[PDB]
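Case study B.
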Amino acid sequence: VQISKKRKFVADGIFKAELNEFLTRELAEDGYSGVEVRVTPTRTEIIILATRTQNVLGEKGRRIRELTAVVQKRFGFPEGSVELYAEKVATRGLCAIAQAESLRYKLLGGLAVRRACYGVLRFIMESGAKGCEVVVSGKLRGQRAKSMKFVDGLMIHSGDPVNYYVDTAVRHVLLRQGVLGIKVKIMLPWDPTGKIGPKKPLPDHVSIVEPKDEILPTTPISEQK
Amino acid sequence: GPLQSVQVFGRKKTATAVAHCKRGNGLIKVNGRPLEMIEPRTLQYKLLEPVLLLGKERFAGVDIRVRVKGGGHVAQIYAIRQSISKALVAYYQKYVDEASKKEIKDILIQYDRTLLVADPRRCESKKFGGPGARARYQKSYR
Amino acid sequence: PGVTVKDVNQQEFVRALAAFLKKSGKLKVPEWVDTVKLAKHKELAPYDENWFYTRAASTARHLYLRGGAGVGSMTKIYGGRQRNGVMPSHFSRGSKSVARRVLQALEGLKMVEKDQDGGRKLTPQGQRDLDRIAGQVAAANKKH
Amino acid sequence: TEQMTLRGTLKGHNGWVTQIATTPQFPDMILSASRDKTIIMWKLTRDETNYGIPQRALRGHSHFVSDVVISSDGQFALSGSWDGTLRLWDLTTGTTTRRFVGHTKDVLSVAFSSDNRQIVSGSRDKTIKLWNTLGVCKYTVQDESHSEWVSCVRFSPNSSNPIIVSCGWDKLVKVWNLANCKLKTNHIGHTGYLNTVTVSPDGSLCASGGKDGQAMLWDLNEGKHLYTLDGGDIINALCFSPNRYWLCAATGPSIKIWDLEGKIIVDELKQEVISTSSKAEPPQCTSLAWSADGQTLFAGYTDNLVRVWQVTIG
Amino acid sequence: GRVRTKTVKKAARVIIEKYYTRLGNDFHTNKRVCEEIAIIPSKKLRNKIAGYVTHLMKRIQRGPVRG
Amino acid sequence: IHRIRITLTSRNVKSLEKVCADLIRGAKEKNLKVKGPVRMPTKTLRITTRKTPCGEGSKTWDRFQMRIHKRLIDLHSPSEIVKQITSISIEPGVEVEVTIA
Amino acid sequence: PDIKLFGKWSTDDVQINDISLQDYIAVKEKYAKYLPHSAGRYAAKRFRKAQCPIVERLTNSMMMHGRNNGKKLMTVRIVKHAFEIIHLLTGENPLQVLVNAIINSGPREDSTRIGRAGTVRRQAVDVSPLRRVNQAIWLLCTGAREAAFRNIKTIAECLADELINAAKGSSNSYAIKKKDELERVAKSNR
RNA sequence: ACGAGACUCUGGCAUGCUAACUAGUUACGCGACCCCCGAGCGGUCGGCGUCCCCCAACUUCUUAGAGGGACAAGUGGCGUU
Ligand SMILES: [Mg+2]
Ligand SMILES: [Mg+2]
Ligand SMILES: [Mg+2]
Ligand SMILES: [Mg+2]
Ligand SMILES: [Mg+2]
Ligand SMILES: [Mg+2]
Ligand SMILES: [Mg+2]
Ligand SMILES: [Mg+2]
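Model:
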């Protein structure tokens, strides 16, 4: 038999969520950005977006050849319907997930919290974002926990434009004395094309065009051509 | 004898009544039953108001059949009234002169505007934290 | 100038049809009509001892208006509100063994027949009888 | 030496009267378009209480109705609206017989041909489209018709080569040749956007007007600037008297009549008695038309009224 | 309350400054001009701007404005 | 010549209408008989949950909602032309089902 | 055509003897309706309920207590029966009796309170015509309601008796007693 | 500059557009019943055809897409006008 459309769409969503969680846990070290599943009756293709594809592919393609195996093992759909591809992100500075992972691995290496946060902020701003915010919370110094906040540029908080103008990422890092939490918000710039920014402008931004020069008429002239 | 007819609708909260009005002798029926057999009969005059205001002479050249659906009893009655009035006005506009339509519309509007214009009121959504849209659950201290 | 069922008042029509069915005398009445209540939400037995004829007339009228109704549909038609002590009231359906026997008795009078799709409907004889009863009701209403 | 006197007023609309159309075949009926999305056919009684009463309402347009024009035989009607569509109605039954689709903006003007076989329409899409009766757009013009909106398009009723004249908000008056549809003449004399353009019944003179307030008369056959007559604030409508050799201009508060032979004002039409309402601006005169009889002017105003002016000869 | 936020007022003033010739006292013509010249990503914002432009044009016709 | 029904199911309306328009245009470019697209009633799945992971504070509720849109297209044509037009139709987020009644 | 309430009570002969309350009782020609049920929106704006016919106002004010909220058809039936009983008892138009009862029941001078939660002190003030009509209708409905409770007597009969006593001016009615007490307190608070 | 507003969903209007046997309406055929004092261009029908060889049209009612529509815009007052 078959299942209803409601169950079908819910199952597709759950499958995508679990796949994204597994790929995150597996490829955090490689700057994993996201997963895109394109379903075709011939084969279901999975595109993995990460900062570097060399580690994802592995030597001679071993590691990726492992992943497309376990996926086929996990969800059970038949062999030959799995094929994973790795594509680098167009701009890594405008992705909140990649920047959160970069900050997490800089902190894990022993770098100073403030220096790493400022470096990430500077890189994000140099990438071309309207603004950025980075919050680090935990036991930064001492038994008492606190929070450090680094902001720059513009930033919107309320309304519907937050959905498509703000990119958010929350991460955890386990240090010797406990868990630190990282929050990164990036405000995308307006782009007429949909490559590196929202196509539509902000609702309250009105752009009035400058009128063109007009020649002052002096005498009635009739032109026949 | 050309086939001339008009179908018009009237609305109350969820109730919709559609009246088909064609050339005829004066028949007016709702769901196949006469006007006087519609329930409840407490609000029977509300259903006879357009005829009483305009007279049987203006209804003597048309047959009207109404189909009602949705809502409650009172809402269905109020939808039927508006459907009848609007159907007669729309028939007079098309197949009679404009002056007769103006007279009928003025007579109907002076008595009650809802005979020709629908009521926009609808139920408001419930909000969590209370039994209904505005009421809230009983607060307690200590 | 032919009177149909929809023209007359429905309550007077039901009363007249019940009287006609009782006077005919060919309706079959169960033995337990005097010891049962018509639903589980009822508190007492019906006040009128000749309730079977009234219920048969009502069922015939409903089959006239909306054909193809089965035992479950008739049970839903005659359901009502049930009050249960200190708990909130709820909708409750009627008794199936009353509706089934009413339908069987009406079929015994050649007024109700099995429907092809399912359920039961009226025979042309039943429609003729109902239209005659409606005409009688209209005549009685107009003459007085 | 003639005085124009207000005879009566027609009240059937709820919005601004935008255009008035007459026909020689039926002197007793008028056709008026308005902003209430309705076109009213007026039956004239010339009685005591009412000069005329509405007869039938043509309602198929979702938006405002901008222009209306009757056919040669006075049996069909054509209408443009702000919804981007044109409608062809049967006046006998009051039903839409044809619909013209293809404009992406408001249709500001529409005009019938001299044989009722060609239809023209100008839109806020900066586009002039030419259709047939069946409703097929035979030719659209994107040949730099206007850099701005096209206000009015008219046909030339002359025995010579058929001509279509248009006015634009780009301060230009363009003259196009029919049946070949090429730009023939440009006229650059105005300082401001244009509203109306009209053609004399001889087919030789054309009048253009707009915000600048000066009605400019050009020569069609030869293609030169002829005259410029000063007027009031804004020229809304320009019309020619078929048999009297006059030019009637519709200004906001008043209506001006010029005698083209002497360039002298013949009459100015305006009335208001109430002193309290003087603070509010008088209703503007939007539309203007001549009856084929030649003795009555019909003027449609912002006041949702149509006023008739009767000529009195002295 | 029907007080206009500074966005509507600023846009209306700039539009009247740049395109005073094309405007008038009609709300609908003004709202048709505004969508032609300006980029408003909302219908309600455009209607508010046009409705303030009409009021400001009437005020200008009455006399000089402080702005 | 078969009576073939195409059912399109999607979560967003823009992509669904784009795909429907593409199919209609493609089919009518082959001088075929097309019926529709007829739009089924939209389905709305709702989940109401508590925001707090625990049972402390004001009783606040999240109301999550998912919307499903459905289109139908009818075609009188042989199978091969239908597959020809359908091959292009592949779009991300839209489920296309082709059946022969 | 002639419009009569319930098909039998005319409105032309009814006349109001109070100049102050003429603008707030709607019983006259343009307010003549067949039934006291219109589903109108009178509470949308202030002072708009002065255009509501007074019979419909009585019907609205009779849907108490909470066990009777929204049951407006029963209230219309009660009003119809009460008018029939009034016509049988008095022999005159029940609408005139209702108008007289509302005129006589409305207090003319009230007392406004300045109260520290326990003790209260008051000062005499005037009552607007609209509040007079509102309070008269409220008092009449309350009197009928309290009369009908726990008694073998129809609510229509009690309402008819209340209206007849109020129109007559007799002190046997609840509304007249309440009005007299309110005016006495206001007089003593001068 | 953030917040507020703007924004998103929702409820009201469209006899104007798009188009539907998994929605209907009207009309026309067949059939059942009633009135033989008006038997009919008569009434009732959630009874059957009218897309699938050939045997009707059309979206008012139902669904959902694209657009329109309202801005304190018009009038009269009160306001530093
Ligand atoms: Mg903001
Ligand atoms: Mg907000
Ligand atoms: Mg509720
Ligand atoms: Mg409730
Ligand atoms: Mg029940
Ligand atoms: Mg109980
Ligand atoms: Mg009692
Ligand atoms: Mg529709």
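Chain D touches chain B through seven residues (CB under 8 Å). The remaining cases will be described in the next quarterly update.
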